[PDB]
């Protein structure tokens, strides 16, 4: 419509913030509908610019701050239905459920003593694993990339050698914003001429408390793993 509203999400530092362009290229501060607040996850949405005019030929920035540490809603991965309403110069609108709400980001790296670790590794919520196998790179650059992407930790090296092969299994740990600790041992082949690694066939073993997020994390990482057309 003249009124075209375009919007995307910007998550700028904790705060997932809503860029909205409602552009009302309308022929007037056309009447506007209705909007509703809610508890969200460890967030709650929390602002609406008050008016409801769709000012003529006019462009507007409508900001929604979201509250990023509260409102539990357990509708995982978000993907929760959201409403913009048809309630005034509007007969309809958008009701939307979100998608676009993923993990790789959330968790931060976190750390451990290795013996205890091992013991723990085994000990943890075993229940998820996903496989590493396939890419576009060596796990040097590739590993770094993935690491940065998820913002997460590989705890320690043994020099055995991530180079000549290595035939290295890398142990990774991370802790998030709402505090889950997740453990990995992924054991991986690694690039190098007619030696081995341009796939893996390494297994990524994922432990996160619910299997459902945990495996999903293994996936998420799987998405993360490579670089291709989303």
């Amino acid at each position: 419509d003249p009124v075209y509203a375009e919007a995307y999400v910007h998550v700028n530092q904790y705060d997932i913030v809503l860029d909205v362009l409602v552009v009302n290229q309308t022929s007037d501060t056309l009447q506007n509908c209705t909007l509703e607040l809610a508890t969200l996850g460890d967030l709650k949405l929390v602002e609406k610019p008050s008016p409801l005019t769709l000012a003529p030929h006019d462009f507007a920035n409508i900001k929604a701050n979201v509250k990023v540490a509260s409102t539990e809603n357990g509708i995982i991965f978000g993907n929760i239905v959201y409403d913009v309403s048809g309630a005034a110069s509007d007969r309809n609108c958008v009701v939307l459920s979100d998608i676009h709400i993923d993990i790789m980001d959330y968790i931060q790296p976190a750390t451990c003593t290795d013996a205890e670790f091992r013991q723990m590794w085994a000990e943890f919520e075993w229940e998820n694993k996903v496989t590493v196998n396939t890419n576009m790179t060596d796990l040097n650059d590739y590993l770094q990339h993935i690491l940065k992407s998820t913002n997460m930790k590989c705890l320690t090296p043994e020099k055995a050698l991530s180079g000549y092969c290595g035939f290295m299994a890398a142990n990774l740990y991370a802790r998030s914003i709402f505090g889950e600790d997740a453990l990995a041992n992924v054991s991986i082949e690694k690039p190098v001429h007619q030696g081995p690694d341009a796939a893996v066939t390494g297994h990524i073993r994922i432990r996160a408390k619910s299997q459902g997020m945990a495996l999903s994390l293994g996936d998420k990482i799987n998405l993360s793993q490579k670089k291709t057309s989303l």
Binding site: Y4, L21, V81, T228
Partner: protein
């Protein structure tokens, strides 16, 4: 195609589908009224209207509101949306089956299951109407053709049809010839629910479960409290119309008309839904899937969805011809529905299914292919698996039931499917229920060729050959030696830039962009298992992006031309008069506004004039500087 969601529970007497929404509002005699605006597989609200049972559900007529009835006997209208009660009166000695909203002075009609129904003025306070002619326990109350003319179905073993007035019931008339309501060979009985000879129709059939009307018409389609659900037409009034609708085992609680479909859907109690015609009529088949107890069936007056209601519970199933056929003629898109009718180019208000002399999403398609001309199409109909079907090929100047065999933009013949194949002029035709090759220089083509008989894949589906080859395999008109196959894959269609030479590729999920033949230019993927993105010609990448519609890329450019309008998908590009699609609705004709093309060229020549001139000015939407304006 899919039954999106399904748990059997609810013991359901009354039912309605949202003519506007894909809601189902459901009345249980659990005492429950529920609105679930069915779309997001979520109930908005749920009120068990009273301790006692709930029989009734009807529309207000507006957009999203319920008017509801319980054994309370009360007419409530509560808006889900506004979660509030509109004006309130209770009910007589039984529940409320139908309601209608009117407004000289915002004025109201209420239809009821007992005694009377009263029509009330809260403005310049006078009487529009009084209806007596009901007694107790109305199964299915109905607005007629004339909406404010009506029929009712009763557990008092009558049917009432009433005449209303603006000062209570009356009609003036004196011209007719005979009557079908009652006047020649056959006809069914009066019942008693009222006392005026409009027609009280006999609702005895151990009582009548449902009554359903024929808009301008007086045919009724019925649910009945007999195995016999007996069909009568009062727009005929046949003999062997003393039809008892028969299961195998007992009942026929209901059997119903679908507004659109010239059909009857029956449902019953041997664990069944039974399938019936009504276009040429006959018991097609019976289908069994539990619930030896039901009382409602429904097909949406939105027609979105279709569903059947039962005691033990309920099911909703969703239709699609997931992915479905096309042709291009100047600045116009042709579609063949997955679900949904035409939408075969241009638009005007909310959604418009393209109805034209190039009927696309309509026919019983096996395959549709442009026979290029801005004036021709080739079409197979009777679709399906047979020995062979018919193809009637039609002229854009005017299509037909079958166009002229005389005309070669009209020809029809027999043949099962017709299919493209690679190295572009050979074709497949099936004209046996298996491999005929079709090959012509012309693409006004209908050619028959058994040579190239080569099964080892028996009649099925592919289109550059891919009986799930997972390859597009190139050939001539017989050979028993491959020319070659390339490993790449299809939506099971290859996309040509208009006619028959598009190295722009479809893939079912993902689509790949090539220039002609395999040159993988870039490869597309998204992950929504639904929509589209469009090419103007060979590889012009349009992508749809929310309420924003975007050029993925040009020259070295990327751009937002114009912005979308709720979901749309780019299908592809018909000229400058732009065309867009969400799948088959939620549509555009569009004044353009390119972005980018101009731009990387423009840019490449430093040129701004344009942008500027447009005064086009974003850089953020989330961001928007990030094509290369960031870089």
């Amino acid at each position: 195609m899919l039954t999106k969601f399904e748990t059997k529970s609810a013991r359901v007497k009354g039912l309605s589908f949202h003519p506007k929404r894909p809601w189902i509002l459901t009345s249980l005699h659990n005492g429950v009224i529920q609105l679930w605006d069915y779309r997001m597989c979520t109930l908005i609200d749920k009120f068990d209207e009273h301790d006692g049972p709930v029989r009734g559900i009807d529309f207000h007529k507006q957009q999203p509101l319920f008017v509801s009835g319980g054994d309370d006997y009360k007419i409530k209208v509560w808006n889900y949306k506004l979660r509030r009660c509109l004006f309130t009166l209770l009910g007589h000695l039984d529940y409320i089956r139908t309601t209608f909203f009117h407004h000289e002075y915002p004025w109201i009609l209420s239809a009821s299951d007992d005694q009377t129904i009263r029509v009330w003025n809260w403005q310049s306070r006078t009487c529009v109407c009084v209806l007596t002619g009901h007694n107790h326990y109305v199964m299915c109350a109905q607005f007629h053709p004339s909406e404010d003319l009506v029929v009712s179905a009763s557990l008092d073993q009558t049917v009432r049809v009433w005449d209303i007035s603006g000062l209570r019931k009356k009609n003036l008339s004196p011209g007719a010839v005979e009557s079908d309501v009652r006047g020649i060979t056959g006809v069914d009985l009066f019942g008693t629910t009222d006392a005026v000879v409009k027609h009280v129709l006999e609702g005895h059939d151990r009582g009548v479960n449902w009554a359903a009307f024929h808009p301008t018409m007086p045919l009724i389609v019925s649910g009945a409290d007999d195995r016999q659900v007996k069909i009568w037409r009062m727009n005929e009034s046949k003999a062997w119309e003393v039809d008892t609708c028969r299961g195998h085992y007992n009942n026929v609680s209901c059997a119903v008309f679908h507004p659109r479909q010239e059909l009857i859907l029956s449902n019953s109690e041997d664990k069944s839904i039974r399938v019936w015609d009504m276009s040429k009529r006959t018991g097609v088949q019976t289908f069994r899937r539990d619930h030896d107890r039901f009382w409602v069936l429904a097909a949406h007056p939105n027609l979105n969805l279709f569903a059947a209601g039962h005691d033990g519970g309920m099911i909703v199933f969703k239709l699609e011809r997931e992915r479905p056929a096309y042709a291009v003629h100047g600045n116009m898109l042709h579609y063949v529905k997955d679900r949904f009718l035409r939408q075969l180019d241009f638009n005007s208000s909310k959604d418009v299914a393209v109805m034209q002399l190039r009927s696309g999403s309509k026919f019983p398609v096996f395959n549709m292919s442009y026979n290029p001309a801005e004036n021709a199409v080739l079409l197979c109909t009777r679709a399906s698996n047979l020995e062979n079907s018919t193809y009637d090929l039609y002229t854009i100047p005017k299509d037909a039931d079958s166009q002229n065999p005389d005309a070669p933009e009209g020809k029809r013949s027999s043949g099962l499917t017709a299919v493209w194949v690679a190295r572009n002029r050979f074709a497949v035709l099936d004209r046996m229920h298996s491999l005929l090759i079709k090959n012509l220089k012309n693409e006004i083509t209908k050619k028959i060729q058994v040579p190239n008989c080569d099964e080892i894949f028996y009649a099925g589906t592919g289109n550059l050959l891919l009986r799930d080859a997972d390859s597009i395999t190139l050939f001539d008109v017989q050979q028993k030696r491959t020319l070659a196959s390339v490993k790449i894959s299809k939506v099971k269609y290859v996309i040509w830039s208009a006619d028959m030479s598009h190295v722009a590729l479809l893939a079912k999920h993902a689509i790949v962009i090539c220039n002609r033949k395999l040159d993988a230019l870039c490869n597309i993927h998204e992950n929504i298992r639904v929509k589209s993105g469009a090419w103007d010609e060979s590889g012009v990448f349009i992508y749809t992006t929310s309420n924003h519609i975007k050029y993925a890329v040009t020259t070295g450019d990327h751009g937002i031309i114009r912005t979308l309008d709720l979901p749309i998908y780019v299908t592809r590009v018909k000229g400058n008069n732009v065309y867009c699609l969400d799948r088959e609705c939620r549509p555009r004709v569009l004044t353009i506004d390119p972005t980018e093309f101009k731009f990387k060229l423009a840019l490449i020549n430093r040129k701004y004039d344009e942008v500027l001139h447009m005064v086009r000015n974003a850089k953020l939407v989330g961001q928007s500087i990030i094509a290369y304006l960031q870089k």
